[PDB]
Amino acid sequence: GLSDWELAAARAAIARGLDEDLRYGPDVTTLATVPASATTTASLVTREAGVVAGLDVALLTLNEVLGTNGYRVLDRVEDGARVPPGEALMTLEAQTRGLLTAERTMLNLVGHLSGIATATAAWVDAVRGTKAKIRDTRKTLPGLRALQKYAVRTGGGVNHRLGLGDAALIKDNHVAAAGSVVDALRAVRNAAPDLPCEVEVDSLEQLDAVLPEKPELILLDNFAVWQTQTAVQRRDSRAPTVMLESSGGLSLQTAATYAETGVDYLAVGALTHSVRVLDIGLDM
Amino acid sequence: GLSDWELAAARAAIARGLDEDLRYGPDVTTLATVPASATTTASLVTREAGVVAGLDVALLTLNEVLGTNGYRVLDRVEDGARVPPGEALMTLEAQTRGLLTAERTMLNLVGHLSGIATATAAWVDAVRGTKAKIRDTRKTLPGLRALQKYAVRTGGGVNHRLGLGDAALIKDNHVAAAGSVVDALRAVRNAAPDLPCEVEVDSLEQLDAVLPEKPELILLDNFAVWQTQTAVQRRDSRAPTVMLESSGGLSLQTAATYAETGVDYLAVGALTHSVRVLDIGLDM
């Protein structure tokens, strides 16, 4: 599931987690109570319902602590699976000391990634029967972007920008320096003609101004549903090729309403900032 | 505010955030619209009320992108400040391109940390007029532990374990291997006599068993209020020196109820997993 870029990011994150955990000394209690030869069958089981994501990251943690052949996976669920409360996501047999050392880092990571996938799946259900797609933002946690981006995709979302040079996004700041939105739009087009041009507008006035310029995407910044409807109507009549994305006053309660206006995407920053963990435990 | 360890953690996190953002190329649009000689006064302003934390981390991001003397702080609030909606947390003058590049990383980091401090401050208010202190856990995001820990302290919480070797914590797994809870307890005492001994129990029977052993702390794993009240009564009469910490079925609505039983600490994993961003913007 994880690509090369994601696999590297995953390894880097697990390595960081373990170091934080092992920086003060080994788990003196398991050393004192559990023999090296001990081995168990343990299960990652959810304490709540949700969508699972990050299971490969769990195996990667074990690889690091136990060695690739330090354990045996007796069974597992696939990432993306919708799962009920006492569901065993993965069952494995491994050295007990290794499992106990890996545990917290492993659980912190899959719990976070499952929290994201869970939430995005809710957004996706909310706008179903609409053409809208749930997209993420750059409002990610430092060091965790590839993984968080991976988890929204697992939940059924689509990734937007990966960084600053990914696409050209004209905002208020650029607009000002350029003079106007269309001034900025033109400047960037002339400077990086091979790059996706996305412009952010906060008024129907700026919208009317940029539509003829035909940028790749216009982000409707904090528009009411009625203004979003209007923006879709004007786009459909004046620049059918311009994609529209709602960004701002979105809540899961208002999701379908906005979606029903016909916008193409809903930019949800909450999917990655503001995430609630999916409670999962290691049962031995 | 930031310790040695925290300042290092912070620099590493901001470094990682910037690399994620600059991995695909520079911000072509600010390069095209704003001249290198440009300078502005910009303000970090909250869009909601809360407790601020991580402002030094903002400064650290600028040092990285702009160089220590690449900007001037005209004004700032102190971390820990309770703040109303349109509050300017920090005002600075800096090279415009530098600010636009640093923006997303800087906002992602203080928004998260403020999110944590704000939440912990709420828990701390919830239990006021009680002797209970709010404590954090090892349920942190990989690579962000020092920062998350710092933020709960800023909101008035108290940090607990920093890692695995930090203190001896006897759980179910250890008890079994040892034979019993007291067996495990004795083994660790004998192996690491200079280490704080914390034992986790899930029943009043196990509690009765370990109390005489006088561990430093007992974590009441998922006890009902009535059982917590009983645990406190038993501790007060049998082992007055043993600290009691509620862990598990805690919510901000029930926090006072648990606190009123007389427990010494409330372990709140939600302070660090499950955090809601404090919405902050950079206004120019």
Side-chain angles (χ1 to χ4, degrees), chain A residues 55-97:
Chain A
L55 252 24
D56 301 322
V57 183
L59 277 353
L60 284 181
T61 309
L62 267 8
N63 287 351
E64 195 62 44
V65 183
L66 295 166
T68 318
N69 304 300
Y71 58 93
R72 182 167 64 100
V73 174
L74 287 34
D75 198 36
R76 69 166 286 182
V77 129
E78 292 310 296
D79 260 10
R82 312 286 282 234
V83 129
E87 190 73 19
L89 309 181
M90 181 181 275
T91 303
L92 33 81
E93 183 185 69
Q95 183 203 31
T96 308
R97 291 186 164 178

mmCIF file of all heavy atoms in Angstrom, chain A residues 55-97:
data_model
loop_
_atom_site.group_PDB
_atom_site.id
_atom_site.type_symbol
_atom_site.label_atom_id
_atom_site.label_comp_id
_atom_site.label_asym_id
_atom_site.label_seq_id
_atom_site.Cartn_x
_atom_site.Cartn_y
_atom_site.Cartn_z
ATOM 1 N N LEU A 55 -1.640 -0.379 8.805
ATOM 2 C CA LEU A 55 -1.243 -1.690 9.259
ATOM 3 C C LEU A 55 0.172 -2.074 8.829
ATOM 4 O O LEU A 55 0.870 -2.775 9.555
ATOM 5 C CB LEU A 55 -2.275 -2.727 8.803
ATOM 6 C CG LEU A 55 -3.190 -3.322 9.882
ATOM 7 C CD1 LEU A 55 -3.335 -2.381 11.104
ATOM 8 C CD2 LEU A 55 -4.531 -3.672 9.249
ATOM 9 N N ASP A 56 0.605 -1.611 7.660
ATOM 10 C CA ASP A 56 1.953 -1.926 7.195
ATOM 11 C C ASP A 56 2.953 -1.199 8.090
ATOM 12 O O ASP A 56 4.041 -1.699 8.387
ATOM 13 C CB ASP A 56 2.171 -1.493 5.750
ATOM 14 C CG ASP A 56 1.219 -2.145 4.799
ATOM 15 O OD1 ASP A 56 0.900 -3.343 4.965
ATOM 16 O OD2 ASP A 56 0.773 -1.435 3.882
ATOM 17 N N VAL A 57 2.583 -0.022 8.547
ATOM 18 C CA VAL A 57 3.459 0.707 9.435
ATOM 19 C C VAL A 57 3.659 -0.097 10.737
ATOM 20 O O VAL A 57 4.715 -0.044 11.355
ATOM 21 C CB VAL A 57 2.884 2.127 9.702
ATOM 22 C CG1 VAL A 57 3.827 2.924 10.561
ATOM 23 C CG2 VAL A 57 2.638 2.870 8.363
ATOM 24 N N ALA A 58 2.676 -0.894 11.130
ATOM 25 C CA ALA A 58 2.823 -1.686 12.345
ATOM 26 C C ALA A 58 3.874 -2.766 12.077
ATOM 27 O O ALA A 58 4.778 -2.976 12.855
ATOM 28 C CB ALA A 58 1.487 -2.319 12.707
ATOM 29 N N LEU A 59 3.750 -3.463 10.957
ATOM 30 C CA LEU A 59 4.724 -4.485 10.612
ATOM 31 C C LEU A 59 6.115 -3.858 10.530
ATOM 32 O O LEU A 59 7.084 -4.468 10.965
ATOM 33 C CB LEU A 59 4.382 -5.118 9.271
ATOM 34 C CG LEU A 59 3.361 -6.248 9.171
ATOM 35 C CD1 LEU A 59 2.922 -6.722 10.543
ATOM 36 C CD2 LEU A 59 2.183 -5.765 8.336
ATOM 37 N N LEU A 60 6.231 -2.651 9.965
ATOM 38 C CA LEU A 60 7.524 -1.982 9.848
ATOM 39 C C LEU A 60 8.178 -1.720 11.202
ATOM 40 O O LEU A 60 9.413 -1.706 11.324
ATOM 41 C CB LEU A 60 7.375 -0.669 9.084
ATOM 42 C CG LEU A 60 7.212 -0.794 7.572
ATOM 43 C CD1 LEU A 60 7.111 0.587 6.945
ATOM 44 C CD2 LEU A 60 8.411 -1.518 7.001
ATOM 45 N N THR A 61 7.357 -1.482 12.222
ATOM 46 C CA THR A 61 7.863 -1.225 13.574
ATOM 47 C C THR A 61 8.466 -2.517 14.133
ATOM 48 O O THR A 61 9.537 -2.525 14.751
ATOM 49 C CB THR A 61 6.744 -0.684 14.485
ATOM 50 O OG1 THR A 61 6.098 0.428 13.833
ATOM 51 C CG2 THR A 61 7.337 -0.173 15.770
ATOM 52 N N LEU A 62 7.790 -3.622 13.857
ATOM 53 C CA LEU A 62 8.236 -4.920 14.291
ATOM 54 C C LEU A 62 9.542 -5.251 13.588
ATOM 55 O O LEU A 62 10.492 -5.683 14.224
ATOM 56 C CB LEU A 62 7.156 -5.947 13.996
ATOM 57 C CG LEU A 62 6.143 -6.265 15.111
ATOM 58 C CD1 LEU A 62 6.278 -5.339 16.310
ATOM 59 C CD2 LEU A 62 4.737 -6.254 14.532
ATOM 60 N N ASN A 63 9.618 -4.988 12.295
ATOM 61 C CA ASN A 63 10.841 -5.255 11.568
ATOM 62 C C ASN A 63 12.000 -4.593 12.246
ATOM 63 O O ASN A 63 13.058 -5.161 12.405
ATOM 64 C CB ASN A 63 10.757 -4.687 10.162
ATOM 65 C CG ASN A 63 9.861 -5.481 9.289
ATOM 66 O OD1 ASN A 63 9.414 -6.557 9.675
ATOM 67 N ND2 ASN A 63 9.608 -4.983 8.089
ATOM 68 N N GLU A 64 11.786 -3.357 12.616
ATOM 69 C CA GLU A 64 12.816 -2.583 13.248
ATOM 70 C C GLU A 64 13.217 -3.147 14.598
ATOM 71 O O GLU A 64 14.383 -3.212 14.894
ATOM 72 C CB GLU A 64 12.328 -1.147 13.395
ATOM 73 C CG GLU A 64 13.401 -0.156 13.713
ATOM 74 C CD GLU A 64 14.448 -0.080 12.615
ATOM 75 O OE1 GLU A 64 14.078 -0.050 11.405
ATOM 76 O OE2 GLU A 64 15.650 -0.062 12.981
ATOM 77 N N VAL A 65 12.245 -3.526 15.423
ATOM 78 C CA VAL A 65 12.528 -4.041 16.747
ATOM 79 C C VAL A 65 12.888 -5.530 16.808
ATOM 80 O O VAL A 65 13.790 -5.928 17.532
ATOM 81 C CB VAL A 65 11.366 -3.760 17.682
ATOM 82 C CG1 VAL A 65 11.713 -4.225 19.050
ATOM 83 C CG2 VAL A 65 11.074 -2.280 17.718
ATOM 84 N N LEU A 66 12.182 -6.351 16.046
ATOM 85 C CA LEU A 66 12.409 -7.793 16.017
ATOM 86 C C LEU A 66 13.182 -8.371 14.828
ATOM 87 O O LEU A 66 13.632 -9.513 14.884
ATOM 88 C CB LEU A 66 11.073 -8.505 16.074
ATOM 89 C CG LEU A 66 10.279 -8.333 17.358
ATOM 90 C CD1 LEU A 66 8.873 -8.796 17.169
ATOM 91 C CD2 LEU A 66 10.934 -9.117 18.428
ATOM 92 N N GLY A 67 13.356 -7.600 13.765
ATOM 93 C CA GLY A 67 14.035 -8.119 12.599
ATOM 94 C C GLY A 67 12.934 -8.708 11.737
ATOM 95 O O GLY A 67 11.961 -9.284 12.252
ATOM 96 N N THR A 68 13.099 -8.599 10.426
ATOM 97 C CA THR A 68 12.110 -9.070 9.473
ATOM 98 C C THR A 68 11.516 -10.428 9.713
ATOM 99 O O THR A 68 10.375 -10.681 9.341
ATOM 100 C CB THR A 68 12.679 -9.072 8.082
ATOM 101 O OG1 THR A 68 13.438 -7.864 7.893
ATOM 102 C CG2 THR A 68 11.540 -9.145 7.052
ATOM 103 N N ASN A 69 12.294 -11.313 10.309
ATOM 104 C CA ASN A 69 11.800 -12.655 10.569
ATOM 105 C C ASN A 69 11.669 -12.838 12.074
ATOM 106 O O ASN A 69 11.785 -13.957 12.602
ATOM 107 C CB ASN A 69 12.764 -13.710 9.982
ATOM 108 C CG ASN A 69 13.010 -13.524 8.483
ATOM 109 O OD1 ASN A 69 12.082 -13.581 7.683
ATOM 110 N ND2 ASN A 69 14.266 -13.297 8.104
ATOM 111 N N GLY A 70 11.436 -11.736 12.771
ATOM 112 C CA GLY A 70 11.322 -11.827 14.211
ATOM 113 C C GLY A 70 9.924 -12.163 14.683
ATOM 114 O O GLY A 70 9.712 -12.383 15.891
ATOM 115 N N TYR A 71 8.992 -12.275 13.736
ATOM 116 C CA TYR A 71 7.610 -12.527 14.070
ATOM 117 C C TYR A 71 6.906 -13.187 12.918
ATOM 118 O O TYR A 71 7.441 -13.237 11.829
ATOM 119 C CB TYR A 71 6.929 -11.196 14.377
ATOM 120 C CG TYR A 71 6.997 -10.218 13.221
ATOM 121 C CD1 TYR A 71 5.961 -10.149 12.293
ATOM 122 C CD2 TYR A 71 8.137 -9.433 13.002
ATOM 123 C CE1 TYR A 71 6.062 -9.356 11.186
ATOM 124 C CE2 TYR A 71 8.238 -8.628 11.889
ATOM 125 C CZ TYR A 71 7.202 -8.609 10.990
ATOM 126 O OH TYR A 71 7.303 -7.894 9.849
ATOM 127 N N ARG A 72 5.671 -13.612 13.158
ATOM 128 C CA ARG A 72 4.842 -14.276 12.171
ATOM 129 C C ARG A 72 3.430 -13.689 12.222
ATOM 130 O O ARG A 72 2.804 -13.618 13.279
ATOM 131 C CB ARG A 72 4.774 -15.768 12.486
ATOM 132 C CG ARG A 72 3.956 -16.579 11.489
ATOM 133 C CD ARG A 72 4.184 -18.085 11.679
ATOM 134 N NE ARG A 72 3.715 -18.556 12.982
ATOM 135 C CZ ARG A 72 2.550 -19.174 13.181
ATOM 136 N NH1 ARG A 72 1.728 -19.405 12.149
ATOM 137 N NH2 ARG A 72 2.187 -19.533 14.418
ATOM 138 N N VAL A 73 2.938 -13.241 11.076
ATOM 139 C CA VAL A 73 1.598 -12.680 10.980
ATOM 140 C C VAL A 73 0.619 -13.819 10.694
ATOM 141 O O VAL A 73 0.618 -14.389 9.602
ATOM 142 C CB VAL A 73 1.537 -11.653 9.841
ATOM 143 C CG1 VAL A 73 0.090 -11.166 9.649
ATOM 144 C CG2 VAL A 73 2.500 -10.508 10.128
ATOM 145 N N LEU A 74 -0.183 -14.183 11.681
ATOM 146 C CA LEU A 74 -1.127 -15.285 11.500
ATOM 147 C C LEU A 74 -2.332 -14.824 10.715
ATOM 148 O O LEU A 74 -2.945 -15.609 9.995
ATOM 149 C CB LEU A 74 -1.572 -15.835 12.849
ATOM 150 C CG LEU A 74 -0.553 -16.665 13.623
ATOM 151 C CD1 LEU A 74 0.862 -16.171 13.423
ATOM 152 C CD2 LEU A 74 -0.904 -16.582 15.075
ATOM 153 N N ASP A 75 -2.662 -13.543 10.836
ATOM 154 C CA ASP A 75 -3.801 -13.011 10.126
ATOM 155 C C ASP A 75 -3.804 -11.505 10.197
ATOM 156 O O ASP A 75 -3.195 -10.923 11.107
ATOM 157 C CB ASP A 75 -5.100 -13.544 10.720
ATOM 158 C CG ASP A 75 -6.289 -13.378 9.773
ATOM 159 O OD1 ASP A 75 -6.120 -13.521 8.540
ATOM 160 O OD2 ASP A 75 -7.411 -13.105 10.245
ATOM 161 N N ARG A 76 -4.448 -10.883 9.208
ATOM 162 C CA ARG A 76 -4.556 -9.434 9.145
ATOM 163 C C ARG A 76 -5.676 -8.973 8.249
ATOM 164 O O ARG A 76 -6.154 -9.717 7.402
ATOM 165 C CB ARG A 76 -3.277 -8.789 8.685
ATOM 166 C CG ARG A 76 -2.968 -9.075 7.256
ATOM 167 C CD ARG A 76 -1.902 -8.128 6.806
ATOM 168 N NE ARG A 76 -2.458 -6.799 6.624
ATOM 169 C CZ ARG A 76 -1.758 -5.755 6.197
ATOM 170 N NH1 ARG A 76 -0.458 -5.884 5.935
ATOM 171 N NH2 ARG A 76 -2.387 -4.620 5.902
ATOM 172 N N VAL A 77 -6.095 -7.732 8.475
ATOM 173 C CA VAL A 77 -7.170 -7.095 7.737
ATOM 174 C C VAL A 77 -6.467 -6.200 6.720
ATOM 175 O O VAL A 77 -5.263 -5.950 6.840
ATOM 176 C CB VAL A 77 -8.098 -6.315 8.753
ATOM 177 C CG1 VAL A 77 -8.344 -4.891 8.364
ATOM 178 C CG2 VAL A 77 -9.406 -7.034 8.880
ATOM 179 N N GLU A 78 -7.172 -5.776 5.677
ATOM 180 C CA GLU A 78 -6.546 -4.911 4.695
ATOM 181 C C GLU A 78 -6.783 -3.474 5.068
ATOM 182 O O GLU A 78 -7.793 -3.148 5.668
ATOM 183 C CB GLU A 78 -7.090 -5.181 3.289
ATOM 184 C CG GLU A 78 -6.709 -6.562 2.704
ATOM 185 C CD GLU A 78 -5.199 -6.893 2.792
ATOM 186 O OE1 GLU A 78 -4.394 -6.170 2.140
ATOM 187 O OE2 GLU A 78 -4.828 -7.881 3.500
ATOM 188 N N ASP A 79 -5.818 -2.621 4.777
ATOM 189 C CA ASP A 79 -5.980 -1.199 5.052
ATOM 190 C C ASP A 79 -7.216 -0.721 4.287
ATOM 191 O O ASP A 79 -7.443 -1.132 3.149
ATOM 192 C CB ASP A 79 -4.751 -0.424 4.567
ATOM 193 C CG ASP A 79 -3.784 -0.085 5.689
ATOM 194 O OD1 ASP A 79 -3.948 -0.593 6.829
ATOM 195 O OD2 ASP A 79 -2.858 0.726 5.427
ATOM 196 N N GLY A 80 -8.036 0.107 4.911
ATOM 197 C CA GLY A 80 -9.227 0.592 4.235
ATOM 198 C C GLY A 80 -10.482 -0.099 4.724
ATOM 199 O O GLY A 80 -11.586 0.375 4.509
ATOM 200 N N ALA A 81 -10.305 -1.197 5.438
ATOM 201 C CA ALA A 81 -11.425 -1.963 5.951
ATOM 202 C C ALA A 81 -12.185 -1.200 6.989
ATOM 203 O O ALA A 81 -11.583 -0.498 7.794
ATOM 204 C CB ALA A 81 -10.923 -3.251 6.529
ATOM 205 N N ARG A 82 -13.509 -1.268 6.905
ATOM 206 C CA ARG A 82 -14.395 -0.591 7.856
ATOM 207 C C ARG A 82 -14.456 -1.676 8.915
ATOM 208 O O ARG A 82 -14.765 -2.832 8.618
ATOM 209 C CB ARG A 82 -15.800 -0.336 7.256
ATOM 210 C CG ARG A 82 -15.802 0.295 5.862
ATOM 211 C CD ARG A 82 -15.427 1.778 5.869
ATOM 212 N NE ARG A 82 -16.538 2.641 6.295
ATOM 213 C CZ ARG A 82 -17.002 3.673 5.587
ATOM 214 N NH1 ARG A 82 -16.455 3.981 4.405
ATOM 215 N NH2 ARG A 82 -17.994 4.414 6.081
ATOM 216 N N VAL A 83 -14.300 -1.294 10.161
ATOM 217 C CA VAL A 83 -14.202 -2.293 11.185
ATOM 218 C C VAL A 83 -15.044 -1.939 12.385
ATOM 219 O O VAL A 83 -15.228 -0.766 12.687
ATOM 220 C CB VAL A 83 -12.696 -2.358 11.509
ATOM 221 C CG1 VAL A 83 -12.415 -2.243 12.963
ATOM 222 C CG2 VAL A 83 -12.066 -3.568 10.850
ATOM 223 N N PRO A 84 -15.675 -2.944 13.013
ATOM 224 C CA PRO A 84 -16.529 -2.779 14.211
ATOM 225 C C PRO A 84 -15.666 -2.824 15.449
ATOM 226 O O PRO A 84 -14.508 -3.225 15.373
ATOM 227 C CB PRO A 84 -17.420 -4.013 14.174
ATOM 228 C CG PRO A 84 -16.495 -5.048 13.624
ATOM 229 C CD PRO A 84 -15.800 -4.307 12.467
ATOM 230 N N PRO A 85 -16.210 -2.410 16.605
ATOM 231 C CA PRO A 85 -15.493 -2.408 17.873
ATOM 232 C C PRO A 85 -14.538 -3.539 18.268
ATOM 233 O O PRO A 85 -13.343 -3.315 18.308
ATOM 234 C CB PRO A 85 -16.600 -2.180 18.880
ATOM 235 C CG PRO A 85 -17.414 -1.145 18.204
ATOM 236 C CD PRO A 85 -17.488 -1.681 16.763
ATOM 237 N N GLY A 86 -14.961 -4.749 18.542
ATOM 238 C CA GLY A 86 -13.898 -5.677 18.951
ATOM 239 C C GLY A 86 -13.138 -6.428 17.853
ATOM 240 O O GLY A 86 -12.729 -7.585 18.012
ATOM 241 N N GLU A 87 -12.923 -5.765 16.735
ATOM 242 C CA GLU A 87 -12.292 -6.386 15.589
ATOM 243 C C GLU A 87 -10.786 -6.586 15.709
ATOM 244 O O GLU A 87 -10.054 -5.661 16.067
ATOM 245 C CB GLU A 87 -12.636 -5.544 14.350
ATOM 246 C CG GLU A 87 -12.262 -6.171 13.025
ATOM 247 C CD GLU A 87 -13.155 -7.333 12.624
ATOM 248 O OE1 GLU A 87 -14.286 -7.463 13.166
ATOM 249 O OE2 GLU A 87 -12.724 -8.108 11.744
ATOM 250 N N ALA A 88 -10.318 -7.792 15.393
ATOM 251 C CA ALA A 88 -8.883 -8.088 15.419
ATOM 252 C C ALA A 88 -8.344 -7.711 14.051
ATOM 253 O O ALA A 88 -8.616 -8.390 13.052
ATOM 254 C CB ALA A 88 -8.654 -9.546 15.674
ATOM 255 N N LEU A 89 -7.625 -6.595 14.003
ATOM 256 C CA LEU A 89 -7.076 -6.071 12.762
ATOM 257 C C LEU A 89 -5.909 -6.891 12.252
ATOM 258 O O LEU A 89 -5.710 -6.991 11.041
ATOM 259 C CB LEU A 89 -6.587 -4.643 12.973
ATOM 260 C CG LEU A 89 -7.575 -3.699 13.628
ATOM 261 C CD1 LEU A 89 -6.957 -2.321 13.740
ATOM 262 C CD2 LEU A 89 -8.829 -3.667 12.812
ATOM 263 N N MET A 90 -5.099 -7.402 13.177
ATOM 264 C CA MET A 90 -3.933 -8.195 12.828
ATOM 265 C C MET A 90 -3.555 -9.083 14.027
ATOM 266 O O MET A 90 -3.610 -8.623 15.203
ATOM 267 C CB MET A 90 -2.773 -7.249 12.482
ATOM 268 C CG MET A 90 -1.471 -7.913 12.057
ATOM 269 S SD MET A 90 -0.160 -6.664 11.717
ATOM 270 C CE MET A 90 -0.582 -6.322 10.124
ATOM 271 N N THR A 91 -3.281 -10.364 13.744
ATOM 272 C CA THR A 91 -2.870 -11.298 14.776
ATOM 273 C C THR A 91 -1.525 -11.806 14.356
ATOM 274 O O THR A 91 -1.327 -12.151 13.188
ATOM 275 C CB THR A 91 -3.795 -12.490 14.923
ATOM 276 O OG1 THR A 91 -5.130 -12.042 15.185
ATOM 277 C CG2 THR A 91 -3.329 -13.336 16.077
ATOM 278 N N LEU A 92 -0.596 -11.814 15.302
ATOM 279 C CA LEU A 92 0.760 -12.269 15.043
ATOM 280 C C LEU A 92 1.369 -13.025 16.219
ATOM 281 O O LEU A 92 0.852 -13.016 17.332
ATOM 282 C CB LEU A 92 1.642 -11.086 14.632
ATOM 283 C CG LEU A 92 1.358 -9.719 15.242
ATOM 284 C CD1 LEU A 92 1.969 -9.633 16.596
ATOM 285 C CD2 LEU A 92 1.970 -8.664 14.365
ATOM 286 N N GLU A 93 2.450 -13.730 15.946
ATOM 287 C CA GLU A 93 3.144 -14.487 16.950
ATOM 288 C C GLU A 93 4.529 -13.878 16.933
ATOM 289 O O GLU A 93 5.131 -13.730 15.870
ATOM 290 C CB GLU A 93 3.182 -15.926 16.497
ATOM 291 C CG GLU A 93 3.810 -16.869 17.466
ATOM 292 C CD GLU A 93 3.910 -18.267 16.877
ATOM 293 O OE1 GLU A 93 4.714 -18.446 15.925
ATOM 294 O OE2 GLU A 93 3.169 -19.174 17.335
ATOM 295 N N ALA A 94 5.013 -13.431 18.075
ATOM 296 C CA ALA A 94 6.331 -12.832 18.102
ATOM 297 C C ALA A 94 6.950 -12.941 19.474
ATOM 298 O O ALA A 94 6.323 -13.405 20.422
ATOM 299 C CB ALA A 94 6.245 -11.396 17.714
ATOM 300 N N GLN A 95 8.178 -12.480 19.583
ATOM 301 C CA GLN A 95 8.845 -12.528 20.851
ATOM 302 C C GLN A 95 8.149 -11.510 21.701
ATOM 303 O O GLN A 95 7.988 -10.367 21.292
ATOM 304 C CB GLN A 95 10.304 -12.145 20.709
ATOM 305 C CG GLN A 95 11.070 -12.244 22.003
ATOM 306 C CD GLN A 95 12.287 -11.370 21.984
ATOM 307 O OE1 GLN A 95 12.294 -10.316 21.340
ATOM 308 N NE2 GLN A 95 13.327 -11.785 22.700
ATOM 309 N N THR A 96 7.784 -11.911 22.902
ATOM 310 C CA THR A 96 7.095 -11.037 23.806
ATOM 311 C C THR A 96 7.840 -9.747 24.171
ATOM 312 O O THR A 96 7.247 -8.668 24.207
ATOM 313 C CB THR A 96 6.673 -11.819 25.036
ATOM 314 O OG1 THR A 96 5.967 -12.990 24.597
ATOM 315 C CG2 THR A 96 5.733 -10.987 25.923
ATOM 316 N N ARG A 97 9.135 -9.815 24.406
ATOM 317 C CA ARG A 97 9.861 -8.604 24.762
ATOM 318 C C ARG A 97 9.830 -7.584 23.635
ATOM 319 O O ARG A 97 9.796 -6.381 23.879
ATOM 320 C CB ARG A 97 11.309 -8.935 25.083
ATOM 321 C CG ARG A 97 11.522 -9.725 26.371
ATOM 322 C CD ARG A 97 13.039 -9.856 26.654
ATOM 323 N NE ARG A 97 13.327 -10.262 28.025
ATOM 324 C CZ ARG A 97 14.542 -10.484 28.526
ATOM 325 N NH1 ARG A 97 15.632 -10.344 27.794
ATOM 326 N NH2 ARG A 97 14.665 -10.869 29.778
#
